Design an enzyme around this catalytic site. Structure first.
Site, PDB file in Angstrom:
ATOM      1  CG  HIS A  65     -90.382 -20.165 -11.987  1.00  0.00           C
ATOM      2  ND1 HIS A  65     -90.475 -20.439 -10.910  1.00  0.00           N
ATOM      3  CD2 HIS A  65     -88.814 -19.967 -12.160  1.00  0.00           C
ATOM      4  CE1 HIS A  65     -89.249 -20.417 -10.236  1.00  0.00           C
ATOM      5  NE2 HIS A  65     -88.652 -20.259 -10.719  1.00  0.00           N
ATOM      6  CG  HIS A  90     -98.289 -22.743 -17.069  1.00  0.00           C
ATOM      7  ND1 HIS A  90     -99.065 -23.589 -16.115  1.00  0.00           N
ATOM      8  CD2 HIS A  90     -97.264 -23.642 -17.306  1.00  0.00           C
ATOM      9  CE1 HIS A  90     -98.537 -25.010 -16.128  1.00  0.00           C
ATOM     10  NE2 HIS A  90     -97.541 -24.705 -16.771  1.00  0.00           N
ATOM     11  CG  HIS A  92     -93.382 -23.874 -20.466  1.00  0.00           C
ATOM     12  ND1 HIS A  92     -92.724 -23.450 -19.605  1.00  0.00           N
ATOM     13  CD2 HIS A  92     -94.526 -24.821 -20.194  1.00  0.00           C
ATOM     14  CE1 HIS A  92     -93.097 -24.218 -18.404  1.00  0.00           C
ATOM     15  NE2 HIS A  92     -94.256 -24.839 -18.741  1.00  0.00           N
ATOM     16  CD  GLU A 103     -91.430 -27.262 -20.102  1.00  0.00           C
ATOM     17  OE1 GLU A 103     -91.115 -26.596 -19.100  1.00  0.00           O
ATOM     18  OE2 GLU A 103     -92.629 -27.926 -19.788  1.00  0.00           O
ATOM     19  CG  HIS A 116     -97.920 -27.001 -20.417  1.00  0.00           C
ATOM     20  ND1 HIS A 116     -96.693 -27.345 -19.587  1.00  0.00           N
ATOM     21  CD2 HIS A 116     -97.512 -27.587 -21.642  1.00  0.00           C
ATOM     22  CE1 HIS A 116     -95.865 -28.057 -20.493  1.00  0.00           C
ATOM     23  NE2 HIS A 116     -96.440 -27.939 -21.668  1.00  0.00           N
ATOM     24  CB  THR A 198     -92.161 -29.586 -17.243  1.00  0.00           C
ATOM     25  OG1 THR A 198     -92.945 -28.426 -16.970  1.00  0.00           O
ATOM     26  CG2 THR A 198     -93.119 -30.381 -17.943  1.00  0.00           C
TER      27      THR A 198
END
Ligand SMILES: *[C@@H]1O[C@H](CO)[C@@H](O[C@@H]2O[C@H](CO)[C@@H](O)[C@H](O)[C@H]2NC(C)=O)[C@H](O)[C@H]1NC(C)=O
Ligand code: AZM
Ligand code: ZN
Length: 259
Positions: A65, A90, A92, A103, A116, A198
């Protein structure tokens, strides 16, 4: 049982297997600056020694992910209601084609990626999990990333080693480096608000802080991120991209800004 960002088990069906994901205070959100309430009393967010990660190697993992990096318990986030400690961090991002992979949005606009940094109330709890389901148990710093006209040496500490963990569950270690350098240079301007994680379980335990200034990486770096990680344990490999949750309903929550 293994959820995904899209598909049969996409972020739409999350509320089914994880009720909490259908909460009244989910994240991320579209931050509309016109509705933003100024709070001259919001103390400056201040990462104590985030350039001091010590000597031991940091853990760089591949969920399936995202790409997650471990952080020493020595990083202490001040300027908040409770005392928080950094746990992990991490990213996104979007798929190769698009340039929208963050996000959170600001006035309906998303950026190329989002960073994040996850913290937890070590003052009141003993573990990251413990605070993951406690009110105000978690605190996350959200850094929006744009594509710059220059290579970002900070982010390379992570990007340069993405091949070592191309497949899911693959792990590796990196020489510790100044995390601080991954944030925009000016942290005075930011927005704060109560939200959730999230990704499932979507625990509504996080106190969000989204910076107004953005961080930048070369189109080369953004590419090396989008087209390098697979979301499977082995071949056939499937591009781990589009790993961002869509803006959630504001449900009449107030959003403050330090500026
Ligand atoms: C996040 O949620 C908490 C709880 O819903 C808010 O805390 C309340 O804040 C008001 C004004 O700041 C106080 O008068 C209440 O006493 C607080 N409740 C308690 C005791 O927890 C908090 O303000 C929210 N944070 C933001 C600004 O989003
Ligand atoms: C156990 C744990 O920390 N889980 C998280 N899940 N989502 C997070 S995020 N993307 O809101 O920072 S943190
Ligand atoms: Zn995240």
């Amino acid at each position: 049982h293994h959820w995904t960002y899209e598909g049969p088990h996409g972020q739409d069906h999350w509320p089914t297997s994880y009720p909490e994901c259908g909460g009244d205070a989910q994240s991320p959100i579209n931050i509309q600056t016109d509705s933003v309430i100024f709070d001259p009393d919001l103390p400056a967010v201040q990462p104590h020694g985030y350039d001091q990660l010590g000597t031991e190697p940091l853990d760089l993992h591949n969920n399936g992910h995202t790409v997650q990096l471990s952080l020493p318990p020595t990083l202490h986030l001040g300027g908040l209601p409770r005392k928080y400690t950094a746990a992990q961090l991490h990213l996104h991002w979007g798929q190769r084609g698009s340039l929208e992979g963050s996000e959170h949005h600001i006035n309906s606009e998303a950026t190329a990626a989002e960073l994040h940094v996850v913290h937890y109330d070590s003052q009141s709890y003993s573990s990251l999990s413990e605070a993951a389901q406690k009110p105000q148990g978690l605190a996350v710093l959200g850094i929006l990333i744009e594509v710059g006209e220059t290579e970002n040496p900070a982010y390379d500490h992570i990007l340069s080693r993405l091949h070592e963990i191309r497949y899911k569950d693959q792990k590796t270690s990196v020489p510790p480096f100044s995390v601080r350098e991954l944030f925009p240079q000016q942290l005075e301007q930011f927005f704060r608000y109560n939200g959730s994680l999230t990704t499932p379980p979507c625990y509504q335990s996080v106190l969000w802080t989204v910076f107004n200034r953005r961080a930048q990486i070369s189109m080369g770096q953004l590419e090396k991120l989008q087209e390098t990680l697979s979301s499977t344990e082995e071949d056939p490999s499937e591009p781990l991209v589009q790993n961002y949750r869509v803006p959630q309903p504001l449900n009449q929550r107030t959003i403050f800004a330090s500026f």
